[PDB]
Amino acid sequence: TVGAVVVDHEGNVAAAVSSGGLALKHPGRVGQAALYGCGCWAENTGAHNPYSTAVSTSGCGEHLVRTILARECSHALQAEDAHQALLETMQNKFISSPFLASEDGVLGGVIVLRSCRCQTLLVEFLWSHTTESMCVGYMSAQDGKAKTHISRLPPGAVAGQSVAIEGGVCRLEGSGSGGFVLVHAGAGYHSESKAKEYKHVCKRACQKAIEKLQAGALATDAVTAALVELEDSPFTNAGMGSNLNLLGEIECDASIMDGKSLNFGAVGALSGIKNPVSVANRLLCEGQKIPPCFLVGEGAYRWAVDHGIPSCPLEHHHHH
Amino acid sequence: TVGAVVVDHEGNVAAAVSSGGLALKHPGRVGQAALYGCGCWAENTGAHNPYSTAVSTSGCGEHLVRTILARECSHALQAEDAHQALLETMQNKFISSPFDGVLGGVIVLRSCRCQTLLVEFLWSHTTESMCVGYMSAQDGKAKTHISRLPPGAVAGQSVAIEGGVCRLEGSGSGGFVLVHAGAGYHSESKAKEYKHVCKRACQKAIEKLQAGALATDAVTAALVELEDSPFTNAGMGSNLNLLGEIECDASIMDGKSLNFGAVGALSGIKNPVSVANRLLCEGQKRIPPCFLVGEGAYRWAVDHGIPSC
Ligand SMILES: */C=C/S(=O)(=O)N1CCN(Cc2ccc(OC(F)(F)F)c(F)c2)[C@@H](COCC#C)C1
Ligand SMILES: */C=C\S(=O)(=O)N1CCN(Cc2ccc(OC(F)(F)F)c(F)c2)[C@@H](COCC#C)C1
Ligand SMILES: [Cl-]
Ligand SMILES: [Cl-]
Ligand code: NA
Ligand code: NA
């Protein structure tokens, strides 16, 4: 599972997530990366909530679905202390949820950003996870150098039971064409090898999002360009290199949310398309112009092909 | 879209929903009846919420998805005034949501111990009409009712809300069920058949409860009866998609275990709720799947002996 969250120079936020799902899963199994409220969330500031907030999840399985975690994090981040709010959410609504009571260990994570104007923009960004490790990258259009970091649980922590949480704060000039992106290449077991490859795909994903923002793109188009980069790494469980299901086939889940319009696009159990996030983003894009927001399986593939999204007929399965 | 909510003689609740989705939808479009939190919700009383609560939605489109309505209703029903809470939610988190005119509805129940069991049940809709049925194991006669918007109301802008109260003896093998056959345009004809299918749905759920069945099996038995009516947009008679085929969404949640099962874009299976219930039942025993779609869901259903069509 890979993810990204973006804020543009106006405080418009977007979020997206993409995943291959569990290895050896039954065909047609859909997990959190496709599910509204669960895999990602983006919500601009409004009357009821003073921050623009964007959230994307990491890890896989049903833990992130049962707790509707991305939306839960977004709502908690309307409290003053963002760090305390996220930590409480991870401890109380994730690790100690009653929805995961008979579960021995809860494995997952989030990337978060929230912004507010003060004309300048204050951006707080955080990551948190209960896995051994998580790889993040982040970048603002002004700093012009992506930063990458491998977040680990400290000694004495217990994976699936302890929380790690880190973050930072960034002030932007909301005058030009700037913004900020935070991405993650996955949260799971530590891997000393390929650790450099996860950091470098996070660096490249941040750069693609920043370049889109610097060319005037919408936050949804910038967060999508970051996820395309993350998907395309053979080392991430999303897009190319996704875990194979029980029949040895690839089935991808992906979704995206726009904070300004609150519209959403998602695909589930999608095979034969190089970049599942591209279909979710196109579903969101066409909805802006009742249009569908969530397509699965054969229908999602045919819809993607009819909208000129690069396909793979040899990688597409249609059982009957 | 059809739905049911059940509470058993112990106060365990369950909820389920099933739908054919939008007429002429693009193949593979999945709507609220398959989506966790959106189509149905069931949650026994716990530390954060003093009532056991079950919710099932009605209508189609994406309005019920965008507001995660079933869970939202469940959380609002933790306030004292259940009627006020549901109305506020329908007006504030549904009609006036930040997410011109929104068409849908809900059935809800909430229960608490007093050894006696107090069950409050409500339905609400912004559609012209909605057909519901309800029954307790003690009264032994199902009641069906057509809820309509009052004169002068405008569908998608006004709210209708009604409900009742039921006291159960929490000692025997009783319970209570509330069902709906859909919320949409009023139909003077076939209204008798919508009431009749709700009546049969309640009786099946009550019969299961009286045989010692779980609340999830009882709510499943209600939805199987609702699906099989050619007049409901679920199971048999589902709206055909853009290519002239049936693709069903269904889900079910257990208040006691909080487990969940769901199918989306399911073709070729007579009773989609049976598959969702079977996914839930297998989960009770690596994390087993709770949400299957498309050809994979069909193959799983047939491999588990669930009748095809
Ligand atoms: C949005 C579409 S739907 O929710 O699938 N849908 C609404 C309900 N329809 C049947 C129905 C209409 C009105 C009812 O109330 C009554 F008038 F009081 F009877 C009712 F109970 C059910 C669905 C029928 O779709 C076509 C078919 C089959 C559509
Ligand atoms: C449920 C499993 S998953 O969320 O799809 N998944 C977890 C992440 N995996 C790759 C990964 C591991 C560790 C990382 O951080 C670290 F150690 F610092 F480098 C990381 F960034 C990514 C993922 C890969 O699975 C096989 C593939 C491809 C599995
Ligand atoms: Cl599986
Ligand atoms: Cl459609
Ligand atoms: Na990949
Ligand atoms: Na039917």
Swiss-Prot record, chain B:
Say yes or no: keyword Plastid present: no
Q: Which GO terms describe its molecular function?
A: identical protein binding; threonine-type endopeptidase activity
Q: Which GO terms describe its biological process?
A: positive regulation of DNA-templated transcription; protein maturation; proteolysis
Q: Where are the transmembrane segments?
A: none
Any one GO cellular component localisation term in the record: cytoplasm
Show the Gene3D superfamilies listed in the entry.
Answer: (Glycosyl)asparaginase (3.60.20.30)
Say if the entry is tagged with keyword Endoplasmic reticulum.
no
**Which keywords belong to this entry?**
Autocatalytic cleavage, Disease variant, Hydrolase, Protease, Threonine protease, Zymogen
Q: Which residues form the active site?
A: T1
Q: Which disease is it linked to?
A: Suleiman-El-Hattab syndrome: An autosomal recessive syndrome characterized by global developmental delay with poor expressive language, poor fine motor skills and hypotonia, microcephaly, feeding difficulties with failure to thrive, recurrent respiratory infections, cardiovascular malformations, cryptorchidism, happy demeanor, and facial dysmorphism.
What does this chain do? Protease responsible for KMT2A/MLL1 processing and activation. It also activates KMT2D/MLL2. Through substrate activation, it controls the expression of HOXA genes, and the expression of key cell cycle regulators including CCNA1, CCNB1, CCNE1 and CDKN2A.
Q: Which family does it belong to?
A: Belongs to the Ntn-hydrolase family.
Q: How does it assemble?
A: Intramolecular proteolysis generates 2 subunits, alpha and beta, which reassemble through a non-covalent association to form the fully active enzyme.
Q: What is this protein called?
A: Threonine aspartase 1
Q: Which organism is it from?
A: Homo sapiens
The organism that produces this protein has a lineage beginning with:
Eukaryota, Metazoa, Chordata, Craniata, Vertebrata
